[PDB]
Coordinates of C-alpha atoms and ligand atoms in Angstrom, one line a residue:
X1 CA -9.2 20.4 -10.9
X2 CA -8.0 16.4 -10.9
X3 CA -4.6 16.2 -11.4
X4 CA -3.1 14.3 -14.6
X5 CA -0.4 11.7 -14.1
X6 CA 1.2 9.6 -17.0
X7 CA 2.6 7.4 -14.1
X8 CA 1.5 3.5 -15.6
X9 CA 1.0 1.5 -12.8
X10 CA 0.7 -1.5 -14.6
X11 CA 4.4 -0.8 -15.8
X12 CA 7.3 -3.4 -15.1
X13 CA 8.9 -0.7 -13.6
X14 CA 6.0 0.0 -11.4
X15 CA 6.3 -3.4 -10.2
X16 CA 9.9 -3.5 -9.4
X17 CA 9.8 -0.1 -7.1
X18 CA 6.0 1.2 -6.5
X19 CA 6.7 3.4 -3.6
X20 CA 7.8 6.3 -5.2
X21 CA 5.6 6.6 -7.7
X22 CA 2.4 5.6 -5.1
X23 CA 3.7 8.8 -2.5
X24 CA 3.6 10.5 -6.1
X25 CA -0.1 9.8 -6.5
X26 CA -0.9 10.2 -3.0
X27 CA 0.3 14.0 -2.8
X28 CA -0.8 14.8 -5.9
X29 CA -4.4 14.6 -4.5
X30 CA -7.0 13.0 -3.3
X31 CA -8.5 11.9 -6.6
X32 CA -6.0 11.5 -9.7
X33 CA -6.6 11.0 -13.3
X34 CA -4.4 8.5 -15.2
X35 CA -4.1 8.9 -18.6
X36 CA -2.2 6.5 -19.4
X37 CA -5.5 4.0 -19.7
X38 CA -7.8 6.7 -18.8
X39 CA -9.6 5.8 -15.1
X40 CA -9.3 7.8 -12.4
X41 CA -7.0 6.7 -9.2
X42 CA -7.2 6.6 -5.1
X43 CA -4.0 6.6 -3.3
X44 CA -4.5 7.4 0.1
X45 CA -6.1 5.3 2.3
X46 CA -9.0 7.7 3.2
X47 CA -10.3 7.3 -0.3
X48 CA -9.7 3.8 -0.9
X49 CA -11.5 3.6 1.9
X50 CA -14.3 5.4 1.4
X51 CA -14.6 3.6 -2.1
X52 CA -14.7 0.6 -0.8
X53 CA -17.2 0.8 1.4
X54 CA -19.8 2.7 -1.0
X55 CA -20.7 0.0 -2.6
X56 CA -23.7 1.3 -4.0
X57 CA -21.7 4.2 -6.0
X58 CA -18.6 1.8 -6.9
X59 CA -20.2 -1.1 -7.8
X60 CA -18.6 -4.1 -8.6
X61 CA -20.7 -6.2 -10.6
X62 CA -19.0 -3.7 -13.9
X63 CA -16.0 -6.2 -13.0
X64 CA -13.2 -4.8 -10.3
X65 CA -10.6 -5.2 -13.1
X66 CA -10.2 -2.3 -16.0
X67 CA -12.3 -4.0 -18.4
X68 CA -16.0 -2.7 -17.7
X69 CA -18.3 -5.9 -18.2
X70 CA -20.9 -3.1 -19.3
X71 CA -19.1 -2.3 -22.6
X72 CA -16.4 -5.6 -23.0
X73 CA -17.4 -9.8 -22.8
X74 CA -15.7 -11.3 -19.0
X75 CA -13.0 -13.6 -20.2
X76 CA -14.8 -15.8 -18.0
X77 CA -18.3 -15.8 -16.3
X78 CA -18.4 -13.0 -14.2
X79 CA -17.8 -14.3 -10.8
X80 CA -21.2 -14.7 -8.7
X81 CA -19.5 -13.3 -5.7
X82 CA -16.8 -10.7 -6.6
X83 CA -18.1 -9.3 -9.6
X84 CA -21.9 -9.2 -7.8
X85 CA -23.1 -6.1 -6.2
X86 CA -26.0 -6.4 -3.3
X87 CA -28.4 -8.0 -3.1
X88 CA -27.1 -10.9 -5.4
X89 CA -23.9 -11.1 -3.6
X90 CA -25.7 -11.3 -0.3
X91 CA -26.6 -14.8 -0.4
X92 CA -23.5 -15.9 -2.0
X93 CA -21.2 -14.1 0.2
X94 CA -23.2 -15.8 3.2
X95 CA -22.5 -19.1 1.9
X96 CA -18.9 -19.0 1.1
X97 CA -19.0 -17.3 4.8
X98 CA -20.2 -20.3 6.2
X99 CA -18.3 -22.5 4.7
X100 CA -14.6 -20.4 5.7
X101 CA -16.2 -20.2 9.0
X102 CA -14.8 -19.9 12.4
X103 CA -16.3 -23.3 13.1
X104 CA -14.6 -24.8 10.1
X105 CA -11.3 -23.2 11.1
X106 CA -11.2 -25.4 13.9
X107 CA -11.9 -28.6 11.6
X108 CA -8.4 -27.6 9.7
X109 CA -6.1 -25.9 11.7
X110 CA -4.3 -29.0 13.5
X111 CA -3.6 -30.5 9.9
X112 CA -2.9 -26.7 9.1
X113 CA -0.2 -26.6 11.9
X114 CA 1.3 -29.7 11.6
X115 CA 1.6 -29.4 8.2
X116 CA 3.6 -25.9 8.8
X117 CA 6.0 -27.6 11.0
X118 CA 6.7 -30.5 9.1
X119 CA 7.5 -28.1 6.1
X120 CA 9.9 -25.8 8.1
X121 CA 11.7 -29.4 9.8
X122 CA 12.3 -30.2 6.0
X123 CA 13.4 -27.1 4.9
X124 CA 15.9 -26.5 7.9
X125 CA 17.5 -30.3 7.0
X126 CA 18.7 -28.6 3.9
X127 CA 19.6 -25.4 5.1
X128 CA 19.8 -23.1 1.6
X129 CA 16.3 -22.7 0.2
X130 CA 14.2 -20.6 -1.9
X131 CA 11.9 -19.4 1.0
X132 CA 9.1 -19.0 -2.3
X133 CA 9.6 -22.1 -4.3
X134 CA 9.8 -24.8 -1.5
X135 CA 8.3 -22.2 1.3
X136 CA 5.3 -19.9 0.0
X137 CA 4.3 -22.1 -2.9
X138 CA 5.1 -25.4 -0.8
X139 CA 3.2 -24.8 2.2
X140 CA -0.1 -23.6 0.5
X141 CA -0.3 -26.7 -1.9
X142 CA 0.5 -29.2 0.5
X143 CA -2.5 -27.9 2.6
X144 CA -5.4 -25.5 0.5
X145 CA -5.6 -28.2 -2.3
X146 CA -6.5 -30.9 0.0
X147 CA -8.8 -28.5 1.8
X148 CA -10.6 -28.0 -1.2
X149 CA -11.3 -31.6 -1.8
X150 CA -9.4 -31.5 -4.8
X151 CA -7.8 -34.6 -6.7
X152 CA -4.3 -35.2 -6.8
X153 CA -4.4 -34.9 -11.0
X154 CA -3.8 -31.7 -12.5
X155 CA -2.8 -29.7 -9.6
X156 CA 0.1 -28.0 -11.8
X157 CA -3.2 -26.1 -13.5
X158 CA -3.7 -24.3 -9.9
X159 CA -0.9 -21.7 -9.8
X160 CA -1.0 -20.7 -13.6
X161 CA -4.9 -20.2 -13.2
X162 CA -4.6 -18.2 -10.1
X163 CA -1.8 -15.3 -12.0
X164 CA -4.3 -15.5 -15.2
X165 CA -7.0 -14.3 -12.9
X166 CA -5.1 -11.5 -11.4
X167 CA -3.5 -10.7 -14.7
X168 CA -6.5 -10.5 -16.5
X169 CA -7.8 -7.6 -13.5
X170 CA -5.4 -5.2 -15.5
X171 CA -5.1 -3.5 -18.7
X172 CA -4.9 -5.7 -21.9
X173 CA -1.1 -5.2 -21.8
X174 CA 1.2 -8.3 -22.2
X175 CA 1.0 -9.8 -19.3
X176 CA -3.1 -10.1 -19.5
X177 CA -2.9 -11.2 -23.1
X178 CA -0.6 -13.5 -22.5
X179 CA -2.2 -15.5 -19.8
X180 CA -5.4 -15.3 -21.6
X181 CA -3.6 -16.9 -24.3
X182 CA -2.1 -19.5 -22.5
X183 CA -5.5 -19.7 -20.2
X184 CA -7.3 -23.1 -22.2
X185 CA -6.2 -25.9 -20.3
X186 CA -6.2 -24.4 -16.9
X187 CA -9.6 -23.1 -17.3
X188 CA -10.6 -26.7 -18.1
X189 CA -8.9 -28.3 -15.8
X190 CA -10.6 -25.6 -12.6
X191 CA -13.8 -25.6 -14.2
X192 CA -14.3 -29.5 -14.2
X193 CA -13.1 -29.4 -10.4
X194 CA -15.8 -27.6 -9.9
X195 CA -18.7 -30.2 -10.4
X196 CA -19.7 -32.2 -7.5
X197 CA -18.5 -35.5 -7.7
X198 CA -14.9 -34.2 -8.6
X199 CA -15.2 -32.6 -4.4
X200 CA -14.0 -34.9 -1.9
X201 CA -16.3 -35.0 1.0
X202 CA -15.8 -32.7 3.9
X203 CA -14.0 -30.6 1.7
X204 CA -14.2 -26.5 1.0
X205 CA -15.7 -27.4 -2.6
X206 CA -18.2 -30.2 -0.9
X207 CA -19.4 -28.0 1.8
X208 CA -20.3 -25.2 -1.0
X209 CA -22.3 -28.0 -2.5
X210 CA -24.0 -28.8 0.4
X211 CA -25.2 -25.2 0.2
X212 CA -27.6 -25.8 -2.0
X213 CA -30.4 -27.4 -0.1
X214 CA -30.8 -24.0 1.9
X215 CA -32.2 -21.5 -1.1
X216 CA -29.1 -19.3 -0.9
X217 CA -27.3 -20.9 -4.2
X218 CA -28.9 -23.4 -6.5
X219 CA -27.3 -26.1 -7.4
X220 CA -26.3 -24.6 -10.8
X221 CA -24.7 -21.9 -9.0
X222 CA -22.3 -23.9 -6.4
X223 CA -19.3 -24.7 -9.3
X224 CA -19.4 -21.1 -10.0
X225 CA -18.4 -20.6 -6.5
X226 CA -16.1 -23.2 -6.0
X227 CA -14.0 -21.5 -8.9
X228 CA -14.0 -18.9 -6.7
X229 CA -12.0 -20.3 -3.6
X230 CA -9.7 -21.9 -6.4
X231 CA -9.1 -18.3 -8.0
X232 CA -8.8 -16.5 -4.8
X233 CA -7.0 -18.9 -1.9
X234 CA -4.2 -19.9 -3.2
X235 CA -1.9 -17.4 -5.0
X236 CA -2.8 -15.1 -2.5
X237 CA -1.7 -16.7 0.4
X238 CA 1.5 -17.5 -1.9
X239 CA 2.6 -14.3 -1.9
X240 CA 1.7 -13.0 1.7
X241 CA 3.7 -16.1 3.4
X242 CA 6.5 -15.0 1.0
X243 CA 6.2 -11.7 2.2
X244 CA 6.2 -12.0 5.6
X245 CA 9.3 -14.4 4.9
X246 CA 10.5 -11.9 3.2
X247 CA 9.8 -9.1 6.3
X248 CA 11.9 -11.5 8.6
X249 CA 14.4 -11.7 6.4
X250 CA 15.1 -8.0 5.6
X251 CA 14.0 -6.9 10.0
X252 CA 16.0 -9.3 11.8
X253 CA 15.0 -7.2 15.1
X254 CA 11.3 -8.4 14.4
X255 CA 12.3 -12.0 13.3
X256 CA 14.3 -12.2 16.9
X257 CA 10.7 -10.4 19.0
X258 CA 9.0 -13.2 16.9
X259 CA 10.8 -15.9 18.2
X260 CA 10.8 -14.6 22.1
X261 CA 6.9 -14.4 21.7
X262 CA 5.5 -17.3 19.1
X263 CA 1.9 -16.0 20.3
X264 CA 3.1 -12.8 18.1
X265 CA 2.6 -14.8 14.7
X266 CA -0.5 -14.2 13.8
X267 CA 0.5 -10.1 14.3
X268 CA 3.4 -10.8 12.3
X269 CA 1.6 -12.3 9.3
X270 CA -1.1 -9.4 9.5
X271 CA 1.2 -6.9 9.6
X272 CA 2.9 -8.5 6.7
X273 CA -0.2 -8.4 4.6
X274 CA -0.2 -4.4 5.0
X275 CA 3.8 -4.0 4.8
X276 CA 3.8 -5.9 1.2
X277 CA 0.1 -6.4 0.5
X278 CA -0.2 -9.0 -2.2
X279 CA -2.8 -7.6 -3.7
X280 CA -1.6 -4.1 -5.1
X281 CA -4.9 -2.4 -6.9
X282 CA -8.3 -3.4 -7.8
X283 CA -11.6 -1.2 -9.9
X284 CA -14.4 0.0 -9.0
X285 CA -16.9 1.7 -11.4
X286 CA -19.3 4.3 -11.0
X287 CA -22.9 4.2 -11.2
X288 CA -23.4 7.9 -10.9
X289 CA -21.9 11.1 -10.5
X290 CA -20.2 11.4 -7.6
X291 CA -18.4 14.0 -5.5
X292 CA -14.7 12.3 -4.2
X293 CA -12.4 14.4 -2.3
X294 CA -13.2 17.7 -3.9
X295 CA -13.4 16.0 -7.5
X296 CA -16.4 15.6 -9.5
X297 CA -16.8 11.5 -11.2
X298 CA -18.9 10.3 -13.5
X299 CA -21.0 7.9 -14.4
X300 CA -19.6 4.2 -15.4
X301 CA -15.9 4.9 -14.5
X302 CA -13.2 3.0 -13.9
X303 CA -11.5 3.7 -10.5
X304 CA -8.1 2.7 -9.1
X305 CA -7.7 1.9 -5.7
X306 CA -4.4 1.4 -4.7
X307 CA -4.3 -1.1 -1.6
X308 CA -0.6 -1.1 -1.1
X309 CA -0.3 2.5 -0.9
X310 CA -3.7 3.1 1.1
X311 CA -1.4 0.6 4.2
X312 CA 1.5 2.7 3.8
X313 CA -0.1 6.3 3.7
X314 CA 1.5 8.3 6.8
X315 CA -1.9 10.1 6.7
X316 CA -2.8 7.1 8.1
X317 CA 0.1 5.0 9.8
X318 CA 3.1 5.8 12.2
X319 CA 6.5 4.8 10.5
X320 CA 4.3 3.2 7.5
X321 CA 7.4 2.1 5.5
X322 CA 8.5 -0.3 9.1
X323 CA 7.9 -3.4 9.7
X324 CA 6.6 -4.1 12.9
X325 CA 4.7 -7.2 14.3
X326 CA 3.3 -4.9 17.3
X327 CA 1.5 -2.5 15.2
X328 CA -2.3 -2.1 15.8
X329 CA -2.7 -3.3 12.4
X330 CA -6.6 -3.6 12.6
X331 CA -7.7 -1.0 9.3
X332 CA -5.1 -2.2 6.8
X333 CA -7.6 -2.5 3.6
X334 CA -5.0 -5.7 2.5
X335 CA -8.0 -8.2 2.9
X336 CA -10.3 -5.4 1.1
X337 CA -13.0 -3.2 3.5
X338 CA -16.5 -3.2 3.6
X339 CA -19.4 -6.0 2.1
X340 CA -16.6 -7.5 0.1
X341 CA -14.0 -7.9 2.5
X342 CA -11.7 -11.5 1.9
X343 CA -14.1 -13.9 2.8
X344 CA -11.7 -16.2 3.1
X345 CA -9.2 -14.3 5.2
X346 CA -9.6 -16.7 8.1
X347 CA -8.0 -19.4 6.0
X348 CA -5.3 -17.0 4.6
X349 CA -4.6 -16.3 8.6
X350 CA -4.4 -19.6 9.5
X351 CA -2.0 -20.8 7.1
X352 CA 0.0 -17.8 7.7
X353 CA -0.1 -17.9 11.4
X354 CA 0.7 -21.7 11.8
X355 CA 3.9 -21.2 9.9
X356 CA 5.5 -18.3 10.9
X357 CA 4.4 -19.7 14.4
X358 CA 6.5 -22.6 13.3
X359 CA 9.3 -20.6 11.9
X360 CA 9.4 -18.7 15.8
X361 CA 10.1 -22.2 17.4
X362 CA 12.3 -23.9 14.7
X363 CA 14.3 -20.9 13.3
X364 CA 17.3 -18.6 14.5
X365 CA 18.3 -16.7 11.5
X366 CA 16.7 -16.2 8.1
X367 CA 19.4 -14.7 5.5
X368 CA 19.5 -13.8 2.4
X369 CA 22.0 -16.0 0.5
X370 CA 21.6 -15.7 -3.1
X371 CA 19.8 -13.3 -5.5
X372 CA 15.9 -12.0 -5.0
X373 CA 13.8 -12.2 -8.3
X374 CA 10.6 -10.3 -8.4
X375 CA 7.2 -11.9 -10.1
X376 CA 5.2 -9.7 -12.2
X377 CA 1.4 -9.5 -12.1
X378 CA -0.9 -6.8 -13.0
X379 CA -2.6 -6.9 -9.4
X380 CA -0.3 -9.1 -7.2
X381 CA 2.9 -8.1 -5.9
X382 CA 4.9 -11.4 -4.6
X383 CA 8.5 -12.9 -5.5
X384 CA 9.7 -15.2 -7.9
X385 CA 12.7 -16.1 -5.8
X386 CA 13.6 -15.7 -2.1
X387 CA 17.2 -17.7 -1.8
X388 CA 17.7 -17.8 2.3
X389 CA 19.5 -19.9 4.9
X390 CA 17.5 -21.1 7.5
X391 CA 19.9 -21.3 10.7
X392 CA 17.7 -23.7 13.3
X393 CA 16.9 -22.2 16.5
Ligands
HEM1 C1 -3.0 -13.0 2.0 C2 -4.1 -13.7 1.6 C3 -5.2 -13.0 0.9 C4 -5.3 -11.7 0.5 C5 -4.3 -10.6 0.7 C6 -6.6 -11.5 -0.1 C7 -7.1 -10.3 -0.6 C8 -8.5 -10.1 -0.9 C9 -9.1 -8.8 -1.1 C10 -8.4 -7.4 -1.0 C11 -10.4 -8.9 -1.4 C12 -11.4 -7.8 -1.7 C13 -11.7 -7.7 -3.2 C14 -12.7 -6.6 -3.4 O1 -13.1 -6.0 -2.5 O2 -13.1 -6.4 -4.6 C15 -10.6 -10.4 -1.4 C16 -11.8 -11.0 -1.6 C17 -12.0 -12.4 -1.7 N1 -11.1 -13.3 -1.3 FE1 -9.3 -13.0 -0.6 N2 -7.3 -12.7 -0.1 C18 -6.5 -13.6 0.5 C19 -6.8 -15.0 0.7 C20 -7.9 -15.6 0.3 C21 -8.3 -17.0 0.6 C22 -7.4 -18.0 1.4 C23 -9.5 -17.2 0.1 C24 -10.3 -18.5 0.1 C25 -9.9 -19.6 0.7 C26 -10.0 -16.0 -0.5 C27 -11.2 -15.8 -1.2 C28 -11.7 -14.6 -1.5 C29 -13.0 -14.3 -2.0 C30 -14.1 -15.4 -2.4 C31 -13.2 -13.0 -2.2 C32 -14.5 -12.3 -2.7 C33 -15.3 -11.8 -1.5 C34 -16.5 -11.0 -1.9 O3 -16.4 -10.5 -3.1 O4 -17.4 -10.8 -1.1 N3 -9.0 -15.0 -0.4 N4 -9.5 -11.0 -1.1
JO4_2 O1 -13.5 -15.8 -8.6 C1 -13.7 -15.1 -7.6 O2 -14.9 -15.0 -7.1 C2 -12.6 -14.3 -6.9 C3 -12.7 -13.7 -5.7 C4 -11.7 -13.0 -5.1 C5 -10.4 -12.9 -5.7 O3 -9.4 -12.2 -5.1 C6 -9.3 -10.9 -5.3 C7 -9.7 -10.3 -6.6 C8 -9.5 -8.9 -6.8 C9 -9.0 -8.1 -5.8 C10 -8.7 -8.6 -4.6 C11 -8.8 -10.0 -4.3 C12 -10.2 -13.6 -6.9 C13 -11.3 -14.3 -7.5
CL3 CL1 -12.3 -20.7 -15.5

């Protein structure tokens, strides 16, 4: 009844060109089997919809990587937020709500903006630069860090930590046991950030502190939580500036509406989060039987949803494989669906409003100028090099 695919989509050639292989899955049916590491998979975006927001039946506390925390150790304490189901990721998810609030947005975003501009007047003084080195990664570290609260110390730890998280969502292949091997230092490093008087005040990791007076989180639980924002904010963001770089660069059309309309950025960053959504797949696991498009599921598996190809299924979206900063974007599962939906996707909107906002004043031409490297994660997809000229508008 469920069709078998060997496809590996944790492959290195999955990474390099996914789309074939993710129409593959999507018209082989609505529920596939994968045999390669035996979970069953969601392509399309009515079932990675649907998945996401049954909560109940694809539960997340059994971890939302392959690993099922039910039968393997976490590599890490299980995340009180992500890998919680209701109701103990209620009050959790209300406080990191709070704190990545729509009031705190307006707290940030003038250092947010100006920081976007000063990085793009910098870049365009030297003309030839790699739009992911001194752009993507730049921009985020010059801004999230300090939003944190974070000391200046051992910020080199932040990057590495973020891929061994996302790595370590996939199958123990090399690229998860590598980063696990490597992982020591980071993990000390985030963890002792974490503790209160390592915050700076008025920061993201202070204001989850401050929590703790309410009875939503106990103290106990607040460093837990600020390991969170430091798994989830920052190699994220990374890779969707890059890839809405990226968008401009390849759709010069868009890059030129962009610049006629700055009020367009925020669409233009949104719409790159579905075009190249950096995060590719997550799990679920089943805590029953369940019926899924015409296929019957047990209990305590492992399924696949496939993000990327749920924002790109035609089932769903006019002219999915075009970029197009006009699109009615609203339903693109890149920030996730349902009780578990980014809760920090008004920071990740921000940063990536404010600079391709800055980009749409400063910038005439982005082009390509040297050769693209792809970076390979298990759950992210992002590049490893983006060599571009920046011609100034
Ligand atoms: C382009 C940028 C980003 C993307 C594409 C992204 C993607 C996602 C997705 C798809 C989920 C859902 C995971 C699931 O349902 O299992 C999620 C959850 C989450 N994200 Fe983001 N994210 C981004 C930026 C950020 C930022 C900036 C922060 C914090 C500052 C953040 C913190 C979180 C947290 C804490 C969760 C867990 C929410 C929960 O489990 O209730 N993310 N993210
Ligand atoms: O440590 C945490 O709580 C946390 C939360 C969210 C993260 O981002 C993801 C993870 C999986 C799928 C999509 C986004 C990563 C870590
Ligand atoms: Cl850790």
């Amino acid at each position: 009844t469920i069709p078998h695919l060997a496809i590996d989509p944790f492959s290195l050639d999955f990474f390099d060109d996914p789309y074939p292989d993710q129409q593959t899955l999507r018209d082989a049916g609505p529920v596939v089997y994968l045999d390669k590491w035996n979970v069953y998979g969601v392509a399309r975006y009515a079932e990675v919809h649907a998945v996401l927001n049954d909560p109940t039946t694809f539960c997340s506390s059994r971890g939302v990587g392959l690993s099922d925390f039910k039968k393997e150790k976490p590599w890490r304490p299980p995340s009180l937020i992500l890998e919680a189901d209701p109701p103990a990721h209620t009050r959790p998810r209300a406080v990191l709500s709070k704190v990545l609030s729509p009031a705190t947005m307006k707290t940030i975003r003038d250092g947010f903006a100006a920081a976007a501009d000063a990085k793009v007047d910098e870049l365009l003084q030297r003309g030839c630069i790699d739009a992911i080195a001194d752009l993507a990664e730049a921009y985020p570290l010059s801004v999230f860090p300090d939003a944190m609260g974070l000391k200046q110390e051992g910020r080199e730890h932040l990057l590495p930590y973020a891929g061994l998280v996302f790595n370590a969502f996939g199958p123990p292949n090399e690229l998860r046991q590598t980063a696990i091997e490597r992982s020591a230092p980071h993990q000390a490093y985030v963890n002792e950030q974490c503790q209160r008087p390592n915050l700076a005040p008025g920061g993201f990791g202070a204001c989850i502190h401050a929590f703790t007076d309410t009875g939503e989180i106990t103290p106990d639980e607040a460093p837990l939580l600020v390991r969170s924002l430091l798994s989830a904010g920052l190699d994220t963001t990374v890779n969707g500036i890059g890839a809405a770089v990226y968008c401009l660069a390849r759709f010069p059309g868009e890059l030129q509406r962009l610049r006629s309309d700055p009020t367009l950025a925020r669409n233009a960053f949104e719409e790159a989060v579905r075009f190249e959504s950096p995060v590719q797949t997550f799990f679920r696991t089943t805590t029953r039987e369940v019926e899924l498009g015409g296929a019957v599921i047990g209990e305590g598996e492992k399924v696949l949803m496939f993000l990327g190809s749920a924002n790109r299924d035609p089932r769903r979206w006019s002219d999915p494989d075009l970029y197009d900063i006009t699109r009615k974007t609203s339903g693109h599962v890149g920030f996730g669906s349902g009780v578990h939906m980014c809760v920090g996707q008004l920071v990740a909107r921000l940063e990536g409003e404010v600079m391709l906002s800055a980009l749409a004043r400063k910038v005439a031409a982005i082009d390509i100028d040297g050769p693209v490297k792809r970076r390979f994660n298990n759950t992210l997809r992002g590049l490893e090099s983006l060599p571009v000229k920046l011609t100034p508008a």
